[PDB]
Amino acid sequence: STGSATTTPIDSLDDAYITPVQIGTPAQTLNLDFDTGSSDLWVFSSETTASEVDGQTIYTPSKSTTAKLLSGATWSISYGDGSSSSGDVYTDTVSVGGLTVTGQAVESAKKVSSSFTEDSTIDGLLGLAFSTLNTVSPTQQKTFFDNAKASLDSPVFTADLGYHAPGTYNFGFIDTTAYTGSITYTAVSTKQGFWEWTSTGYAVGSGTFKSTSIDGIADTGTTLLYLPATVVSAYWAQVSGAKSSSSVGGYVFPCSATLPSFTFGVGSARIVIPGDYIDFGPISTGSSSCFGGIQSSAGIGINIFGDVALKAAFVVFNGATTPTLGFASK
């Protein structure tokens, strides 16, 4: 089997991407944030505290003939940005882009934090990291990908995120028309439950490539690119007037600037992030101070190849017995 679904930015800054997902019978379609940095499929639901719902589409298990309460199971998750959600669990049929899993754990939110309530465009998350991170207790549950894997033509999914445009998540096949040149594969460590890999270095604009190992995670659920302070300082030093602002919470730059590209290494290959991808616009409406798309990972504890990086590439998440990550230009 295979699946193929279009993923669409939620706003003009590509802050996140939503992908339609069919849950239950008859289908209830919810727009979920596919997140390669977590491992819970959770949804706004008929059980979500009413004051914490503001425009989202909800999953109503009582209207699904295939929903079954997973008795005794609860979940609770906290994300890197400080947001959180929790609730109980149903199993139900879940389909993505024509690919169907029966018996998928669908985690129903009783509570969500303010950032979720305030984002009316995101109806939940679909985690695509390793199932060892799943938060369901007392019986840990498998991700949609883990459950689908045996049925898939090939045990892979791919992320092809757009810059200010729709893109695609494919399951079970590699679309050889979706990228240019060749795909370069690189080793993955699952030791922390993430798609964790080591970049071979970086360049700023037309500068020379610096060979240096940068361990980090491929995380479609994080907006920006978070790298070591040394790397980030080297980048922003090439932008006149750029500075780190503790009041704003990261590097800002004059909106009149032209940003240089940023290149990262994948083995001997190079992925180039155009300067425009690194512009996250005015810090507040009407401001001439703009927020940078490359920020320091210092104090996160991990480097994160978020959407800013991933959208510059066609990315293969290979879930074979020995997992790997592939990157191609596009």
UniProtKB/Swiss-Prot annotation:
Query: Quick check: keyword Disulfide bond in the entry?
Result: yes
Task: Report domain Peptidase A1 positions.
Answer: 17-328
Catalysed reaction equations from the record: Hydrolysis of proteins with specificity similar to that of pepsin A, prefers hydrophobic residues at P1 and P1', but does not cleave 14-Ala-|-Leu-15 in the B chain of insulin or Z-Glu-Tyr. Clots milk
- The answer to whether keyword Protease applies is yes
Here the disulfide bonds are 255-290
Q: Which superkingdom?
A: Eukaryota
* Coiled-coil ranges (or none): none
Gene Ontology MF terms in the entry? aspartic-type endopeptidase activity
> Where along the chain is the active site annotated?
35, 199
> What Enzyme Commission number(s) apply to this enzyme?
3.4.23.22
Gene Ontology biological-process entries: proteolysis
Q: Which UniProt keywords apply?
A: Aspartyl protease, Disulfide bond, Hydrolase, Protease, Signal, Zymogen
Query: Could you say which protein family the record assigns here?
Result: Belongs to the peptidase A1 family.
Q: What name has this protein been given in UniProt?
A: Endothiapepsin
Which species does the entry assign this protein to?
Answer: Cryphonectria parasitica (Chestnut blight fungus)
Q: Which gene encodes it?
A: EAPA
Q: Which residues of the full protein are shown?
A: 90 to 419 of 419
